[PDB]
mmCIF file of all heavy atoms in Angstrom:
data_model
loop_
_atom_site.group_PDB
_atom_site.id
_atom_site.type_symbol
_atom_site.label_atom_id
_atom_site.label_comp_id
_atom_site.label_asym_id
_atom_site.label_seq_id
_atom_site.Cartn_x
_atom_site.Cartn_y
_atom_site.Cartn_z
ATOM 1 N N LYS A 11 266.823 213.828 114.286
ATOM 2 C CA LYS A 11 267.416 212.549 114.666
ATOM 3 C C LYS A 11 266.966 211.386 113.785
ATOM 4 O O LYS A 11 266.029 211.520 113.004
ATOM 5 C CB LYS A 11 267.111 212.270 116.141
ATOM 6 C CG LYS A 11 267.676 213.335 117.070
ATOM 7 C CD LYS A 11 267.372 213.054 118.531
ATOM 8 C CE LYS A 11 267.917 214.161 119.419
ATOM 9 N NZ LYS A 11 267.651 213.912 120.865
ATOM 10 N N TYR A 51 277.215 215.024 122.487
ATOM 11 C CA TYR A 51 276.552 214.812 123.770
ATOM 12 C C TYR A 51 277.500 214.651 124.959
ATOM 13 O O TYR A 51 277.165 213.978 125.931
ATOM 14 C CB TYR A 51 275.632 213.589 123.683
ATOM 15 C CG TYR A 51 274.376 213.819 122.872
ATOM 16 C CD1 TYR A 51 274.040 212.980 121.812
ATOM 17 C CD2 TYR A 51 273.501 214.851 123.196
ATOM 18 C CE1 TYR A 51 272.856 213.163 121.095
ATOM 19 C CE2 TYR A 51 272.319 215.042 122.491
ATOM 20 C CZ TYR A 51 271.999 214.196 121.445
ATOM 21 O OH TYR A 51 270.816 214.375 120.764
ATOM 22 N N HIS A 54 276.357 214.582 128.610
ATOM 23 C CA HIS A 54 275.632 213.436 129.169
ATOM 24 C C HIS A 54 276.475 212.171 129.336
ATOM 25 O O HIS A 54 275.979 211.158 129.825
ATOM 26 C CB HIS A 54 274.440 213.096 128.263
ATOM 27 C CG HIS A 54 273.593 214.276 127.905
ATOM 28 N ND1 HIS A 54 272.697 214.845 128.783
ATOM 29 C CD2 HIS A 54 273.536 215.020 126.775
ATOM 30 C CE1 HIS A 54 272.125 215.890 128.211
ATOM 31 N NE2 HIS A 54 272.617 216.018 126.992
ATOM 32 N N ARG A 57 275.779 210.014 132.269
ATOM 33 C CA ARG A 57 274.437 209.486 132.492
ATOM 34 C C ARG A 57 274.296 208.025 132.050
ATOM 35 O O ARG A 57 274.959 207.578 131.111
ATOM 36 C CB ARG A 57 273.418 210.351 131.747
ATOM 37 C CG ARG A 57 273.224 211.754 132.318
ATOM 38 C CD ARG A 57 272.650 212.671 131.250
ATOM 39 N NE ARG A 57 271.779 213.726 131.765
ATOM 40 C CZ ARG A 57 270.625 213.511 132.393
ATOM 41 N NH1 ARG A 57 270.197 212.277 132.599
ATOM 42 N NH2 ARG A 57 269.882 214.533 132.789
ATOM 43 N N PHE A 59 271.975 206.519 130.398
ATOM 44 C CA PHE A 59 271.454 206.322 129.049
ATOM 45 C C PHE A 59 272.379 206.832 127.952
ATOM 46 O O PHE A 59 272.013 206.815 126.778
ATOM 47 C CB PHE A 59 270.085 206.996 128.900
ATOM 48 C CG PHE A 59 270.105 208.480 129.148
ATOM 49 C CD1 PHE A 59 270.496 209.364 128.142
ATOM 50 C CD2 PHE A 59 269.735 208.997 130.387
ATOM 51 C CE1 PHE A 59 270.515 210.743 128.368
ATOM 52 C CE2 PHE A 59 269.749 210.368 130.622
ATOM 53 C CZ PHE A 59 270.139 211.244 129.613
ATOM 54 N N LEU A 63 272.126 206.400 123.867
ATOM 55 C CA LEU A 63 271.956 207.666 123.170
ATOM 56 C C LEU A 63 272.926 207.723 121.988
ATOM 57 O O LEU A 63 272.548 208.072 120.873
ATOM 58 C CB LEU A 63 272.257 208.830 124.121
ATOM 59 C CG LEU A 63 271.599 210.186 123.847
ATOM 60 C CD1 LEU A 63 272.323 211.270 124.637
ATOM 61 C CD2 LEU A 63 271.630 210.499 122.373
ATOM 62 N N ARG A 87 264.217 226.296 120.551
ATOM 63 C CA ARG A 87 263.950 225.371 121.655
ATOM 64 C C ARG A 87 262.475 225.421 122.041
ATOM 65 O O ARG A 87 261.882 224.405 122.398
ATOM 66 C CB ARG A 87 264.805 225.719 122.876
ATOM 67 C CG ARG A 87 266.289 225.424 122.704
ATOM 68 C CD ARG A 87 266.549 223.931 122.499
ATOM 69 N NE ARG A 87 267.136 223.293 123.680
ATOM 70 C CZ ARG A 87 266.504 223.120 124.837
ATOM 71 N NH1 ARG A 87 265.253 223.534 124.981
ATOM 72 N NH2 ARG A 87 267.126 222.537 125.855
ATOM 73 N N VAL A 92 259.878 220.318 125.142
ATOM 74 C CA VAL A 92 260.772 219.974 126.245
ATOM 75 C C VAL A 92 261.298 218.553 126.057
ATOM 76 O O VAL A 92 260.809 217.817 125.203
ATOM 77 C CB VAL A 92 260.080 220.107 127.627
ATOM 78 C CG1 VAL A 92 259.658 221.551 127.854
ATOM 79 C CG2 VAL A 92 258.878 219.178 127.715
ATOM 80 N N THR A 93 262.291 218.173 126.853
ATOM 81 C CA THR A 93 262.910 216.848 126.752
ATOM 82 C C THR A 93 261.935 215.681 126.581
ATOM 83 O O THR A 93 262.097 214.864 125.673
ATOM 84 C CB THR A 93 263.802 216.572 127.974
ATOM 85 O OG1 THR A 93 264.720 217.660 128.146
ATOM 86 C CG2 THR A 93 264.582 215.282 127.775
ATOM 87 N N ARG A 104 258.006 218.234 119.286
ATOM 88 C CA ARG A 104 257.915 217.023 120.091
ATOM 89 C C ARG A 104 256.493 216.832 120.604
ATOM 90 O O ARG A 104 256.029 215.704 120.765
ATOM 91 C CB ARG A 104 258.885 217.091 121.267
ATOM 92 C CG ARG A 104 260.342 216.998 120.855
ATOM 93 C CD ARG A 104 261.250 217.226 122.043
ATOM 94 N NE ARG A 104 262.659 217.092 121.682
ATOM 95 C CZ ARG A 104 263.662 217.412 122.490
ATOM 96 N NH1 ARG A 104 263.404 217.885 123.701
ATOM 97 N NH2 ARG A 104 264.918 217.272 122.085
ATOM 98 N N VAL A 111 261.027 209.781 125.300
ATOM 99 C CA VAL A 111 262.214 210.612 125.464
ATOM 100 C C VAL A 111 263.404 210.095 124.646
ATOM 101 O O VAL A 111 264.244 210.879 124.202
ATOM 102 C CB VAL A 111 262.622 210.709 126.958
ATOM 103 C CG1 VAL A 111 262.876 209.322 127.522
ATOM 104 C CG2 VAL A 111 263.856 211.580 127.108
ATOM 105 N N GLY A 112 263.465 208.781 124.440
ATOM 106 C CA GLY A 112 264.554 208.191 123.675
ATOM 107 C C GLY A 112 264.339 208.285 122.175
ATOM 108 O O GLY A 112 265.194 207.900 121.375
ATOM 109 N N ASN A 114 262.843 211.377 120.690
ATOM 110 C CA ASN A 114 262.245 212.703 120.706
ATOM 111 C C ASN A 114 262.427 213.542 119.448
ATOM 112 O O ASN A 114 262.555 214.760 119.515
ATOM 113 C CB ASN A 114 262.700 213.491 121.942
ATOM 114 C CG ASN A 114 264.192 213.705 121.985
ATOM 115 O OD1 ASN A 114 264.914 213.323 121.066
ATOM 116 N ND2 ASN A 114 264.665 214.327 123.060
ATOM 117 N N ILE A 116 263.979 215.433 117.439
ATOM 118 C CA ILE A 116 264.952 216.449 117.063
ATOM 119 C C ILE A 116 265.799 217.016 118.198
ATOM 120 O O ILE A 116 265.426 216.941 119.367
ATOM 121 C CB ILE A 116 264.180 217.612 116.383
ATOM 122 C CG1 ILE A 116 265.096 218.790 116.061
ATOM 123 C CG2 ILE A 116 263.058 218.081 117.308
ATOM 124 C CD1 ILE A 116 264.372 219.915 115.330
ATOM 125 N N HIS A 117 266.947 217.580 117.829
ATOM 126 C CA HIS A 117 267.853 218.214 118.780
ATOM 127 C C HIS A 117 268.020 219.695 118.441
ATOM 128 O O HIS A 117 268.093 220.068 117.269
ATOM 129 C CB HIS A 117 269.238 217.574 118.739
ATOM 130 C CG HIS A 117 270.290 218.406 119.405
ATOM 131 N ND1 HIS A 117 270.500 218.390 120.765
ATOM 132 C CD2 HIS A 117 271.129 219.345 118.907
ATOM 133 C CE1 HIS A 117 271.420 219.283 121.079
ATOM 134 N NE2 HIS A 117 271.819 219.878 119.969
ATOM 135 N N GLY A 118 268.096 220.529 119.473
ATOM 136 C CA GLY A 118 268.292 221.954 119.279
ATOM 137 C C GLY A 118 269.253 222.482 120.333
ATOM 138 O O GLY A 118 269.135 222.127 121.506
ATOM 139 N N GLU F 150 261.937 203.254 122.502
ATOM 140 C CA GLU F 150 263.253 202.680 122.732
ATOM 141 C C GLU F 150 263.094 201.167 122.810
ATOM 142 O O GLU F 150 263.983 200.443 122.313
ATOM 143 C CB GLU F 150 263.837 203.193 124.047
ATOM 144 C CG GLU F 150 264.554 204.519 123.944
ATOM 145 C CD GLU F 150 265.194 204.927 125.252
ATOM 146 O OE1 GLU F 150 264.807 204.380 126.305
ATOM 147 O OE2 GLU F 150 266.081 205.804 125.231
HETATM 148 N N1 SON G 201 265.963 209.869 130.873
HETATM 149 C C1 SON G 201 266.423 209.757 129.624
HETATM 150 N N2 SON G 201 266.509 208.527 129.072
HETATM 151 C C2 SON G 201 266.969 208.419 127.815
HETATM 152 N N3 SON G 201 267.376 209.376 126.980
HETATM 153 C C3 SON G 201 267.275 210.583 127.562
HETATM 154 C C4 SON G 201 266.822 210.853 128.843
HETATM 155 N N4 SON G 201 266.862 212.215 129.099
HETATM 156 C C5 SON G 201 267.331 212.731 127.989
HETATM 157 N N5 SON G 201 267.600 211.800 127.017
HETATM 158 C C6 SON G 201 268.119 212.033 125.668
HETATM 159 O O1 SON G 201 269.222 212.922 125.759
HETATM 160 C C7 SON G 201 268.994 214.072 124.904
HETATM 161 C C8 SON G 201 269.644 215.300 125.498
HETATM 162 O O2 SON G 201 268.968 215.683 126.698
HETATM 163 C C9 SON G 201 269.181 217.076 126.954
HETATM 164 O O3 SON G 201 269.319 217.530 128.089
HETATM 165 C C10 SON G 201 268.736 217.997 125.839
HETATM 166 P P1 SON G 201 267.090 218.077 125.310
HETATM 167 O O4 SON G 201 266.403 216.779 125.517
HETATM 168 O O5 SON G 201 266.373 219.170 126.011
HETATM 169 O O6 SON G 201 266.963 218.395 123.753
HETATM 170 C C11 SON G 201 267.480 214.143 124.794
HETATM 171 O O7 SON G 201 267.091 214.863 123.628
HETATM 172 C C12 SON G 201 267.088 212.669 124.733
HETATM 173 O O8 SON G 201 267.199 212.100 123.444
#
Side-chain angles (χ1 to χ4, degrees):
Chain A
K11 300 180 182 181
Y51 287 126
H54 311 284
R57 290 158 149 297
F59 60 82
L63 206 196
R87 290 297 254 68
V92 298
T93 308
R104 290 174 178 171
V111 58
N114 61 3
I116 175 177
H117 164 83
Chain F
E150 275 184 342

